[PDB]
């Protein structure tokens with residue numbers, strides 16, 4: 001790991017002294033919250049196909065810098081942020097129930113341009 | 116209105132640089148305000164043959180917005196490949 | 211025979227043909243067709259070496275302008291335009307680019323007219339271009355040289 005990064009460049013975000021562990025527990029949380037959603041839902045397939053690979057690389061690659069190229073997500077600090085954001089979205093997507101057929105068709109000529 | 120050499124040193128020393136090499140006030144170095152008559156070029160389509168508009172127009176070659184799904188396994192796909200982190204400068208690194 | 215320069219096989223409307231093809235070509239509708247012309251009316255008109263092909267064609271297409279029906283747009287505007295450009299070519303005051311445009315407007319005349327005379331006047335222009343293009347070009351350089 002070497003000397004920890006003095007700063008991530010972006011004001012706000014602080015350097016994470018436990019990068020891999022945060023990724024692992026966050027990605028496991030993703031697969032949990034997804035698990036509470038019906039399998040046929042397209043949200044399940046894509047999110048698990050995305051997170052489980054990301055969980056695969058973080059476990060495999062122990063070096064931080066090589067990990068950054070592995071997920072092409074900048075530094076780790078913004079990776080833990082995105083993994084956190086996917087957690088909130090997945091936690092909020094289960095109540096929204098966005099897998100049934102659309103609420104209703106829009107009016108006849110609501111689209112189409114020009115009039 | 117040329118400064119006396121005595122104060123040429125004063126302005127140069129007090130600012131730690133050579134002002135007289137490049138001054139804000141312009142002088143005879145400016146381009147002349149009267150210039151010879153210019154001959155402007157023609158465009159690429161100024162050809163007296165094989166310049167049919169049907170093979171040259173740009174407006175009549177725009178299609179209506181292509182429709183891909185209407186309300187009337189597959190790998191996850193990003194809108195575009197993630198950007199590549201910018202490299203540090205070479206001409207001037209950290210200031 | 212060597213004094214022959216070009217032959218108008220039948221009628222002015224059918225394009226002229228240089229002696230290189232006049233060696234054999236049989237005088238029938240099909241044979242003239244692969245000869246890039248037509249039998250037409252079997253009016254054999256023969257220019258010699260001394261004949262100025264550019265002048266002869268201009269005289270030919272000037273006749274079409276005088277005997278233009280005047281109804282439809284192409285044969286009226288185009289053939290008179292053909293007179294102006296071809297007259298400039300005979301003198302030589304034109305520029306080399308205008309050779310191909312005359313070909314283009316000739317195609318615009320062709321097939322866009324109620325009367326077949328429009329295509330009857332476009333063919334001689336096309337035939338002249340396809341067989342004697344260097345002749346106008348050098349004649350065109352002659353004007354650009356003595357006029358300076």
Ligand code: SF4
Nearest residue numbers: 279280281282285325
């Ligand atoms: S193209 Fe035929 S119909 Fe039309 S103006 Fe010419 S001669 Fe008359």
